[PDB]
Tab-separated table of C-alpha atoms and ligand atoms in Angstrom:
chain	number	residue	atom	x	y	z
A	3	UNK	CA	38.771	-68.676	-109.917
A	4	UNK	CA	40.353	-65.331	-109.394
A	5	UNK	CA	40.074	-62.248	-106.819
A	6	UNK	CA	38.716	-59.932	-110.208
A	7	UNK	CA	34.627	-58.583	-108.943
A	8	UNK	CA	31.968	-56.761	-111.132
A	9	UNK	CA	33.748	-57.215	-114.353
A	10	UNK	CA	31.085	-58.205	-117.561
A	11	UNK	CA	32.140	-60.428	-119.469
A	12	UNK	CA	32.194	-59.637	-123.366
A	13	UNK	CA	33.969	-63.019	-124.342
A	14	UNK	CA	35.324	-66.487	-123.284
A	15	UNK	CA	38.607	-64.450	-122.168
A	16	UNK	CA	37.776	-60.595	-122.377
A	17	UNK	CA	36.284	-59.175	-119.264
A	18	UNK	CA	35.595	-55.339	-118.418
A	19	UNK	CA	34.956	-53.017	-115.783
A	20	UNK	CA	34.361	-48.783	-115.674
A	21	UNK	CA	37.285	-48.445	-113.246
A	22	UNK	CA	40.518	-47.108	-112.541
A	23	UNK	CA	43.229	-49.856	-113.382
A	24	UNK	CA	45.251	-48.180	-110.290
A	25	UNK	CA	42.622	-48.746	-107.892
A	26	UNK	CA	41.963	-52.112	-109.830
A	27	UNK	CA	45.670	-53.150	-109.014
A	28	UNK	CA	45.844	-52.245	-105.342
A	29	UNK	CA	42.381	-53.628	-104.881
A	30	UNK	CA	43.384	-57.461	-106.684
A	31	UNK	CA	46.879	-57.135	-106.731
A	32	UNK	CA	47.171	-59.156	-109.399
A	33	UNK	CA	49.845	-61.354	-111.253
A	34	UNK	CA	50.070	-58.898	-114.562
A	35	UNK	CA	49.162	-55.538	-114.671
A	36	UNK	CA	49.929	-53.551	-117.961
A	37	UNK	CA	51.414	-50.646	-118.353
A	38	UNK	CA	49.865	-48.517	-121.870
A	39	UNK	CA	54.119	-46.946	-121.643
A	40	UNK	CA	55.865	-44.980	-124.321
A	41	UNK	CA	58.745	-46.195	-126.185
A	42	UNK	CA	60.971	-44.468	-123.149
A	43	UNK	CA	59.484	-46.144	-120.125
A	44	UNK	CA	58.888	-41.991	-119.123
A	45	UNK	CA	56.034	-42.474	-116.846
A	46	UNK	CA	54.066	-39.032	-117.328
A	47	UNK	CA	50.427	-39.345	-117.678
A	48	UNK	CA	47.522	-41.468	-118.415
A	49	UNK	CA	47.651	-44.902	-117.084
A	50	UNK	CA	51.801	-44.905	-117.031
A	51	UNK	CA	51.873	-41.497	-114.964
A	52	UNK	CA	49.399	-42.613	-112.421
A	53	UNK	CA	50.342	-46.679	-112.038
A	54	UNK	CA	54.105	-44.600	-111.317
A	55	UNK	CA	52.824	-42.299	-108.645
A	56	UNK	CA	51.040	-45.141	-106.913
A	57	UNK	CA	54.367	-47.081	-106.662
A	58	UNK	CA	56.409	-43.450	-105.025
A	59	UNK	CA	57.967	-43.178	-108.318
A	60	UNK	CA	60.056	-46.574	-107.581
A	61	UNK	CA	58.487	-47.661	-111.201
A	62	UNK	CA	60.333	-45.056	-112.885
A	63	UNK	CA	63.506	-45.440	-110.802
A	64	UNK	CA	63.567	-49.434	-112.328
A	65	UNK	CA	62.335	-47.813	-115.684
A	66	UNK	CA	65.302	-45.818	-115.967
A	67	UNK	CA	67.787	-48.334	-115.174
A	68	UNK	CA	65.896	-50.639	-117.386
A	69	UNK	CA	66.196	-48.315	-120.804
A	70	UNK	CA	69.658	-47.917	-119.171
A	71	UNK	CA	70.587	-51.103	-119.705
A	72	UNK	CA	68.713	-52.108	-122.945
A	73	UNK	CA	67.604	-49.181	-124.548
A	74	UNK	CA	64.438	-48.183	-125.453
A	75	UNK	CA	61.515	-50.407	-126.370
A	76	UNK	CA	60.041	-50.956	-130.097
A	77	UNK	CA	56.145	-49.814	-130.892
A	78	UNK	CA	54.521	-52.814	-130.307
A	79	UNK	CA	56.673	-53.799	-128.319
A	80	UNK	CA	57.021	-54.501	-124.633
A	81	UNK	CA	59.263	-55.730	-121.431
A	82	UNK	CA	58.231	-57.382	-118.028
A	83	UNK	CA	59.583	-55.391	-115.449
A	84	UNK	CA	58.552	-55.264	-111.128
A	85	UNK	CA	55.194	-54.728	-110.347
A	86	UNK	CA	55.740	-52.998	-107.217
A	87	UNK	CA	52.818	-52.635	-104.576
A	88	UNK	CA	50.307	-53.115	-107.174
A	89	UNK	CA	50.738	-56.180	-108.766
A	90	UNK	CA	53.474	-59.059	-108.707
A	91	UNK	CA	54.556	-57.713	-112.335
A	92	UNK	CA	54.260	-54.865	-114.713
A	93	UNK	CA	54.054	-55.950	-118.299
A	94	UNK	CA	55.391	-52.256	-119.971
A	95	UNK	CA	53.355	-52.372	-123.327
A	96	UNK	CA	53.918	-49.516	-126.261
A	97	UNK	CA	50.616	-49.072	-128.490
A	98	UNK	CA	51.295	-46.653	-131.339
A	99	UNK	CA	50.869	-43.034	-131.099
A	100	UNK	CA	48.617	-42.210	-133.820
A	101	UNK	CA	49.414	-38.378	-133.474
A	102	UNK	CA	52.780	-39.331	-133.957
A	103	UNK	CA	51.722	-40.707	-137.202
A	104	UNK	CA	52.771	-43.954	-135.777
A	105	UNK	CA	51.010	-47.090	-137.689
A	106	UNK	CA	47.608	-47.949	-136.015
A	107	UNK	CA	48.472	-51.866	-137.841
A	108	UNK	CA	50.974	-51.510	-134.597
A	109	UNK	CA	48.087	-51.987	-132.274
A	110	UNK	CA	47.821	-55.687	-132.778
A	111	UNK	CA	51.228	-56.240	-132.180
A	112	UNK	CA	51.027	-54.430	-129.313
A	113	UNK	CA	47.799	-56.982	-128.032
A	114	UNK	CA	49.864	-59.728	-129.265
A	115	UNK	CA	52.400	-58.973	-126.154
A	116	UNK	CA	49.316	-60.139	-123.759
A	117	UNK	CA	49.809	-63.423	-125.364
A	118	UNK	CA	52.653	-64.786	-123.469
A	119	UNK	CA	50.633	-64.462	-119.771
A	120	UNK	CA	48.041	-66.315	-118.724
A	121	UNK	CA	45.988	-63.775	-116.815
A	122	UNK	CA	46.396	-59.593	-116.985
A	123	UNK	CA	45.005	-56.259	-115.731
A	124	UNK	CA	45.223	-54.233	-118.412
A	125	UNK	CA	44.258	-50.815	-119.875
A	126	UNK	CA	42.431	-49.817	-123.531
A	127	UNK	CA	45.819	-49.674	-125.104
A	128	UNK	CA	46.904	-46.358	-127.341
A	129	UNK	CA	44.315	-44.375	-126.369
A	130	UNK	CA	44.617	-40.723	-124.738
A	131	UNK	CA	47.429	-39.123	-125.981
A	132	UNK	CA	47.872	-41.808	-128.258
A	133	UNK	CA	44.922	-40.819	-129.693
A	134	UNK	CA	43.399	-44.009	-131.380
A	135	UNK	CA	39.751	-44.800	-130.952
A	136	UNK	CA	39.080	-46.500	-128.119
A	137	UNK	CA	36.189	-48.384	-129.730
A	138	UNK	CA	38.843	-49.510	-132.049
A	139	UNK	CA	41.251	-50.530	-129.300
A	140	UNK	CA	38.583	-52.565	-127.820
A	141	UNK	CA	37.965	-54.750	-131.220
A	142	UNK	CA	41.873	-55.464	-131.917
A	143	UNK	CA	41.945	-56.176	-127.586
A	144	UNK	CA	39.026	-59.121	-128.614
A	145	UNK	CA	40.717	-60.380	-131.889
A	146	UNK	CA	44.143	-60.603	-130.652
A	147	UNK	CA	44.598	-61.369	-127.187
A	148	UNK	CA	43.654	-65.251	-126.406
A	149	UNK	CA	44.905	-65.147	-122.968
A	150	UNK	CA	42.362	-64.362	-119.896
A	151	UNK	CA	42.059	-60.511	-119.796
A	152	UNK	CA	40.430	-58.047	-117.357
A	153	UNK	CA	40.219	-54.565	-119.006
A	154	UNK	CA	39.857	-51.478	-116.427
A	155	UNK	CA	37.918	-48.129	-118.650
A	156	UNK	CA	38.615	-44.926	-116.786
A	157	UNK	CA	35.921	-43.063	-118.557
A	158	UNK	CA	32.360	-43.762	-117.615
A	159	UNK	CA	30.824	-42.670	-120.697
A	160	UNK	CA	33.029	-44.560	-122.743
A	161	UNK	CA	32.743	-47.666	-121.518
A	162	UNK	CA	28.620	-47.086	-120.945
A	163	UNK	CA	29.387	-46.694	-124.872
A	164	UNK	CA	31.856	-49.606	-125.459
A	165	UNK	CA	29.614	-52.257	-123.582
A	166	UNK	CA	26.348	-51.396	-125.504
A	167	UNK	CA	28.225	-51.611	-129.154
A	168	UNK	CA	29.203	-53.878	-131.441
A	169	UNK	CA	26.904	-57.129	-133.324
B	201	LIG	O1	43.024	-46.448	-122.418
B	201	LIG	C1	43.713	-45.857	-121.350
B	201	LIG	C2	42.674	-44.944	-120.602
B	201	LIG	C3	42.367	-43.629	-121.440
B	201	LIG	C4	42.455	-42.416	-120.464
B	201	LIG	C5	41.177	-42.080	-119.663
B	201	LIG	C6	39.941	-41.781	-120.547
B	201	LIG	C7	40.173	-40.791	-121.723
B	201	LIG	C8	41.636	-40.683	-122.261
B	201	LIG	C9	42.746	-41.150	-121.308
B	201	LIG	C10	43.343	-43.029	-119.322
B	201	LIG	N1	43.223	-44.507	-119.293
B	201	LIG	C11	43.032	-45.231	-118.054
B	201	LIG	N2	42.400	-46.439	-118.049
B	201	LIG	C12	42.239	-47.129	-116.860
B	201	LIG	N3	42.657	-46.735	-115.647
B	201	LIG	C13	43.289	-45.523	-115.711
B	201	LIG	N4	43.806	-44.942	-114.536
B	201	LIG	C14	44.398	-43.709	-114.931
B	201	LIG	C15	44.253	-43.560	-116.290
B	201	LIG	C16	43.534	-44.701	-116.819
């Protein structure tokens, strides 16, 4: 039993909710939230720009020292890192940029990253600027992650349009 409300389930593990994964986090606080980051850990936009401005920038100030230290991370690739006032954790995952011409066949990999924690917040990954198909995102989220996952859509009409599709 967990601190998660309103979410509809879609499987034995996938949950989701129209909601803002920021207000999500601050709400639940959580163990896991994810992160849909760039290869840089540059915290501009989207989910990564707004989780960062929620945490004063102090997300970015760790990023920097992280990719300082190691380098940047792979596509479809990811590292745990603080989660700051929002969460215990941040698990930093890179989807592929599709208009980067970045392989989509990344997106699964990127899913498979979810894997190795038990229970996660977590954002439609490699959508926005990304630019992949959020319907898509949603079918590689429910055939790749096994682990107990609450999925926060931003957009209303999308996820009216995600929860009444499929077979
Ligand atoms: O898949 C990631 C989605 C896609 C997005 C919004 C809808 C159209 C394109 C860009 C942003 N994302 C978010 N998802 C959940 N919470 C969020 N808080 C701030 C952003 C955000």
């Amino acid at each position: 039993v967990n601190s998660f409300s309103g979410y509809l389930k879609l499987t034995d593990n996938v949950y989701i909710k129209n909601a803002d994964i920021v207000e999500e986090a601050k709400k639940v606080k959580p163990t896991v939230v994810v992160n849909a980051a760039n290869v840089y850990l540059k915290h501009g936009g989207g989910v990564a720009g707004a989780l960062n401005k929620a945490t004063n920038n102090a997300m970015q100030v760790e990023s920097d020292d992280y990719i300082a230290t190691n380098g940047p991370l792979k596509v479809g690739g990811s590292c745990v890192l603080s989660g700051h006032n929002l969460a215990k954790h941040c698990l930093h995952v890179v989807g592929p940029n599709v208009n980067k011409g970045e392989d989509i066949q990344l997106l699964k990999s990127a899913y498979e990253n979810f894997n190795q924690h038990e229970v996660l917040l977590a954002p439609l990954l490699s959508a926005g600027i990304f630019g992949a198909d959020p319907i898509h995102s949603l079918r590689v989220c429910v055939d790749t992650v096994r682990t107990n996952v609450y999925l926060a859509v931003f957009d209303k009409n999308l996820y009216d349009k995600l929860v009444s599709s499929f077979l």
